[PDB]
Amino acid sequence: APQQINDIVHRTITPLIEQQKIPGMAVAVIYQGKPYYFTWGYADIAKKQPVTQQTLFELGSVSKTFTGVLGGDAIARGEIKLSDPTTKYWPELTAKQWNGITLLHLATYTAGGLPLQVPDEVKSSSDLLRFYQNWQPAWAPGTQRLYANSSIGLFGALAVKPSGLSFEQAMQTRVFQPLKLNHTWINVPPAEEKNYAWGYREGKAVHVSPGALDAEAYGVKSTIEDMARWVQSNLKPLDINEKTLQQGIQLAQSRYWQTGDMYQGLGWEMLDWPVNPDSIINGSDNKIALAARPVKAITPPTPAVRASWVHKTGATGGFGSYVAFIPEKELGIVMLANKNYPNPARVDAAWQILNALQ
Numbered sequence: 001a002p003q004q005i006n007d008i009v010h011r012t013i014t015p016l017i018e019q020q021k022i023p024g025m026a027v028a029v030i031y032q033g034k035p036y037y038f039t040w041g042y043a044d045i046a047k048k049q050p051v052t053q054q055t056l057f058e059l060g061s062v063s064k065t066f067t068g069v070l071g072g073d074a075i076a077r078g079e080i081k082l083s084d085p086t087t088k089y090w091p092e093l094t095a096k097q098w099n100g101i102t103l104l105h106l107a108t109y110t111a112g113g114l115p116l117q118v119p120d121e122v123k124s125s126s127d128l129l130r131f132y133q134n135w136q137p138a139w140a141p142g143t144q145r146l147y148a149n150s151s152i153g154l155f156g157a158l159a160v161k162p163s164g165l166s167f168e169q170a171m172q173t174r175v176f177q178p179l180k181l182n183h184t185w186i187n188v189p190p191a192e193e194k195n196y197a198w199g200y201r202e203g204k205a206v207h208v209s210p211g212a213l214d215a216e217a218y219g220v221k222s223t224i225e226d227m228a229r230w231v232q233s234n235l236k237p238l239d240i241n242e243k244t245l246q247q248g249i250q251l252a253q254s255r256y257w258q259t260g261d262m263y264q265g266l267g268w269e270m271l272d273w274p275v276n277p278d279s280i281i282n283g284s285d286n287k288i289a290l291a292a293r294p295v296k297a298i299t300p301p302t303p304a305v306r307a308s309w310v311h312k313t314g315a316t317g318g319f320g321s322y323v324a325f326i327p328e329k330e331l332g333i334v335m336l337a338n339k340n341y342p343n344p345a346r347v348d349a350a351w352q353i354l355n356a357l358q
């Protein structure tokens with residue numbers, strides 16, 4: 001691998017691993033379109049299994065980028081429109097507060113204060129209907145952004161209804177398979193269990209727990225190789241032969257709302273490049289990323305801007321992931337770890353690496 005890439009990756013990540021006590025890590029850098037891989041440490045400490053290019057990590061909320069692109073593909077197929085009322089796809093949602101809440105609002109966290117998590121008490125489909133029927137918005141639609149699994153997760157579930165496919169079947173057949181993501185899963189199959197890393201939380205080995213709208217909001221597991229291919233696909237959507245998927249990728253990077261220097265896509269978030277690194281680094285901290293923020297509508301949305309820092313953080317109890325790329329430069333990075341370590345440390349390392357290579 002080019003010595004420049006070797007050196008900047010190792011000089012940034014080795015200290016990160018030490019400071020954050022990360023048990024295992026995989027990194028991919030995409031440079032001029034080509035992937036370069038790096039691994040450290042352990043997928044399973046007790047069984048002494050190393051991280052490899054085939055190790056599966058929980059992506060946590062990086063899953064939201066797959067959801068956003070699947071939804072974009074459904075729009076490109078003509079199956080849904082973001083301007084459609086939520087009730088068009090969920091007729092049982094009759095409560096009056098839903099008047100005016102569209103798929104766009106669900107996809108982009110702007111419905112008016114849907115909560116970060118679906119309550120753990122919501123176990124059945126009837127429980128889920130009750131939850132959404134009884135939910136009272138704090139704000140008018142399209143006025144404030146509040147990052148929420150219950151928002152984008154519902155978007156993902158409704159987006160696939162016209163196809164008649166389950167969310168998992170839709171994702172597999174419409175996104176994973178065409179992109180040759182053959183080791184990316186909503187449910188890890190028995191064949192791949194030997195590769196599924198444990199997450200580590202307070203020194204205990206853990207995997208994500210089942211919950212409502214988990215698949216849609218935070219449930220994808222993938223390898224560093226498949227994630228590098230995901231970044232390649234998002235860097236250069238016009239290379240994708242499947243027309244609706246090519247289009248769905250572009251729709252997910254459109255700019256729908258602005259808060260501060262950040263623009264909300266479908267799953268993806270974007271800032272203009274060059275970025276102020278303090279803006280993305282500090283902005284990634286959950287004290288900011290999870291706050292209620294007024295939004296400005298971008299009317300109409302700006303098509304994907306090539307000069308962007310496009311990124312998404314993800315976590316589960318045991319894992320921490322980060323992806324960022326800059327289309328204009330054919331440059332990107334994926335960082336997968338089996339510890340949920342602070343967001344700003346991820347963004348700082350990613351920017352140090354990409355800035356050096358840019």
Ligand SMILES: *[B]([O])([O])[C][N]S(=O)(=O)C1=[C][C]=C(C2=NN=N[N]2)[C]=C1C(F)(F)F
Pocket residue numbers: 059060061062116117149207208209210218313314315316317318340
């Ligand atoms: B995304 O990664 O930003 C969603 N974050 S979250 O806070 O909603 C979340 C959701 C679910 C889990 C989890 N379920 N079972 N194990 N972990 C964890 C988390 C997070 F807190 F982010 F880790």
